[PDB]
């Protein structure tokens, strides 16, 4: 009665394979969700490949989950069976440390668990998480495209909150894959002036229609230099000239890293000192911000353009992600036998 059908990597770099496991008894602090959709992004690939030397094999990935509650632990508050919720990067936190009790559960300094790190995620017919991390969806939010908001969306949304970004500010976005695409739509709803840095000069018309006010060839060194002093906030999605880009920050501006790149970034202290600039990063959101983002997306239409695959075609979906051709986020539709 606790069997979960899933897709797992048995070792690093393998094709994902059909995998059944015994989830054990649902614990009082947990909820169980029947998966409807699950987004796919490069953080899944990184865990599948043990890039961060934290993967427990077999690993069931998937951390952009939309589904409905099918079971509640006795400690769950505010939820009901049948309710549509989202589950993102974080599955459990301790609820009692200073960070958790003060509403920063993503910064938990006690025991905490990420959805796909030593835990089974959303590439499955059911998934479990702590009740505070099952984020209620507005009834009017399209479930098919909402999954990516729990990862790509929140990693852009949280720096907007933290840096108190307003419509008057000018924000730059470095690299426009699926993550840069979500950033542009969110920033357009925010009212900001938007510059997109792209190495593909052919995409200039599509980026502008996406909401970008300006498009800069990130390969042109002189063109990046010509952006000196413009940005209150610079959002990097990349994975590879940081002096040149720090120069494009306005006074008091921030360079903010979204995804976990492992390559160290050499920072000249003088470049931070002279303009009172900062380098920062932020995790994948606490429950209050996740709730706020879903509410905002129901009002503004920030959801990404998605390509939908059946979950039974996960390996094909992973190949599509790797091709770079996805426009713009890949989502799996759960299609397990009932
Ligand atoms: Zn993701
Ligand atoms: Zn905690």
Residue 159 is inside which H or E element, if any? helix 152-162
Collect contacts of 209-215 with beta carbons under 8 A, ≥24 apart.
210/181, 210/184, 210/185, 211/184, 211/185, 211/187, 212/173, 212/184
Stated in angstroms to one decimal place, the resolution of this structure is: 1.9
Q: Are 305 and 148 in contact (CB under 8 A)?
A: no
How far apart are alpha carbons 332 and 314 in whole angstroms?
Answer: 7
CA of 114 to the centre of ligand 2 (A): 13
Handedness of CA 303, 308, 312, 315 (dihedral sign): negative
Q: Do residues 209 and 99 both lie within one domain?
A: no
Q: Do residues 179 and 127 both lie within one domain?
A: no
Q: Are 66 and 136 in contact (CB under 8 A)?
A: no
Residue 99 is inside which H or E element, if any? helix 98-101
Binding site, annotated residues: 41, 63-64, 94, 97, 100, 108, 151
Q: Do residues 254 and 163 both lie within one domain?
A: yes
Nearest alpha-carbon partner for 30 in 114, 127, 104, 150: 127
Handedness of CA 146, 150, 153, 158 (dihedral sign): positive
Q: Which ligand is nearest to the Cα of residue 101, counting in written order?
A: 2
Q: What angle do CA 195, 146, 21 make, to 5 degrees?
A: 125
Q: Do residues 23 and 123 both lie within one domain?
A: yes
Count of domains in the chain? Answer: 2
- Joined together, the tokens standing for residue 96 give 């009692």
First to last CA, the chain: 13
Q: Do residues 126 and 169 both lie within one domain?
A: no
Q: Do residues 309 and 257 both lie within one domain?
A: no
How far apart are alpha carbons 86 and 148 in whole angstroms?
Answer: 10
CA of 125 to the centre of ligand 2 (A): 28
Nearest alpha-carbon partner for 211 in 185, 191, 235: 185
Nearest alpha-carbon partner for 92 in 73, 106, 74, 72: 106
Experimental method: X-ray
How far apart are alpha carbons 38 and 61 in whole angstroms?
Answer: 10
How far apart are alpha carbons 284 and 152 in whole angstroms?
Answer: 9
Binding site, annotated residues for Zn(2+): 41, 63-64, 94, 97, 100, 108, 151
CA of 64 to the centre of ligand 1 (A): 6
User: What residue has token string 């051709």?
Assistant: 325
Classify 137 as helix, strand or coil: coil
How far apart are alpha carbons 180 and 148 in whole angstroms?
Answer: 12
Nearest alpha-carbon partner for 223 in 241, 239, 235, 236: 241
Its domain, for residue 254, covers 152-304
- Joined together, the tokens standing for residue 325 give 């051709």
For the CA atoms of 214, 259, 239, 310, the dihedral, rounded to the nearest 10 degrees, stands at -90
User: Dihedrals φ, ψ of 333, to 5°?
Assistant: -95, 125
Q: Are 260 and 46 in contact (CB under 8 A)?
A: yes
Nearest alpha-carbon partner for 30 in 80, 83, 71, 88: 71
- Joined together, the tokens standing for residue 72 give 């509640």
- Joined together, the tokens standing for residue 286 give 């606490």
CA of 66 to the centre of ligand 1 (A): 13
Burial readout 237-268 (b: 16 or more C-beta within 10 A, e: otherwise): bbeeeeeebbbbbbeebbbbbbbeeeeeeeee
Q: Do residues 82 and 2 both lie within one domain?
A: yes
How far apart are alpha carbons 228 and 247 in whole angstroms?
Answer: 5
Q: Are 294 and 137 in contact (CB under 8 A)?
A: yes
Report CA 26 to chain centroid distance, whole Å.
26
Residue 331 is inside which H or E element, if any? strand 329-333
Q: Do residues 115 and 165 both lie within one domain?
A: no
Q: Do residues 175 and 292 both lie within one domain?
A: yes
Q: Which ligand is nearest to the Cα of residue 133, counting in written order?
A: 2
CATH of the domain at 234: 3.40.50.720
How far apart are alpha carbons 43 and 155 in whole angstroms?
Answer: 12
Q: Are 134 and 65 in contact (CB under 8 A)?
A: no
Q: Are 94 and 112 in contact (CB under 8 A)?
A: yes
Q: Do residues 219 and 104 both lie within one domain?
A: no
How far apart are alpha carbons 322 and 338 in whole angstroms?
Answer: 31
Task: Say if residue 124 is exposed, middle or buried (CB neighbours under 10 Å; 0-12, 13-18, 19+).
Answer: buried
How far apart are alpha carbons 234 and 250 in whole angstroms?
Answer: 10
User: Dihedrals φ, ψ of 227, to 5°?
Assistant: -90, 15
CA of 106 to the centre of ligand 2 (A): 8
CA of 96 to the centre of ligand 2 (A): 5
Q: What's the residue count for the chain?
A: 338
Q: Do residues 169 and 242 both lie within one domain?
A: yes
How far apart are alpha carbons 277 and 256 in whole angstroms?
Answer: 11
Nearest alpha-carbon partner for 220 in 203, 204, 193, 201: 201
Q: Do residues 197 and 327 both lie within one domain?
A: no
Q: What angle do CA 171, 175, 176 make, to 5 degrees?
A: 90
Task: Say if residue 68 is exposed, middle or buried (CB neighbours under 10 Å; 0-12, 13-18, 19+).
Answer: middle
């Amino acid at each position: 009665n606790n069997t979960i059908q899933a897709y797992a990597a048995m070792q690093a770099g393998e094709k994902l394979v059909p995998y059944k496991f015994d989830a054990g008894e649902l614990q009082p602090h947990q909820v169980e969700v029947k998966v409807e959709y699950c987004g796919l992004c490069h953080s899944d690939i990184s865990v599948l490949n043990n890039e961060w030397h934290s993967t427990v094999y077999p690993v069931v990935a998937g951390h952009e989950i939309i589904g409905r509650i099918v079971a509640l632990g006795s400690e769950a508050k505010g939820l009901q069976i049948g309710q549509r919720v989202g589950i993102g990067w974080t599955a459990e936190s301790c609820q009692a440390c200073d960070e958790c009790i003060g509403g920063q559960q993503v910064l938990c300094t006690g025991e905490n668990i990420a959805t796909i790190v030593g835990h089974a995620g959303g590439f499955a017919d059911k998934v479990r998480a702590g009740w505070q991390w099952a984020i209620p969806l507005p009834e009017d939010l399209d479930p098919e495209s909402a999954g990516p908001l729990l990862c790509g969306g929140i990693t852009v949304f949280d720096p907007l909150l933290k840096h108190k970004i307003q419509a008057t500010h000018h924000v730059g976005v470095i690299g426009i894959g699926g993550l840069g695409h979500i950033a542009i739509k969110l920033l357009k709803a925010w009212g900001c002036e938007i510059t997109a840095f792209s190495s593909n000069p052919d995409k200039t018309e599509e980026l502008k229609a996406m909401g970008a006010d300006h498009v800069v060839n990130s390969r042109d060194t002189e063109a990046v230099k010509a952006q000196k002093g413009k940005f209150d906030l610079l959002l990097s999605t990349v994975n590879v000239n940081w002096r040149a880009f720090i120069s494009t920050l306005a006074p008091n501006g921030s360079l903010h890293f979204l995804g976990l790149t492992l390559e160290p970034v050499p920072v000249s202290v003088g470049s931070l000192i002279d303009g009172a600039k900062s380098v920062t990063g932020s995790p994948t959101g606490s429950p209050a911000a996740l709730r706020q983002l879903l509410k905002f997306a129901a009002r503004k239409k920030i959801a990404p353009q998605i390509e939908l695959f059946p979950m039974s075609q996960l390996n094909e979906a992973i190949e599509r992600l790797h091709s770079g051709q996805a426009r713009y986020r890949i989502v799996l539709k759960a299609d397990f036998a009932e």
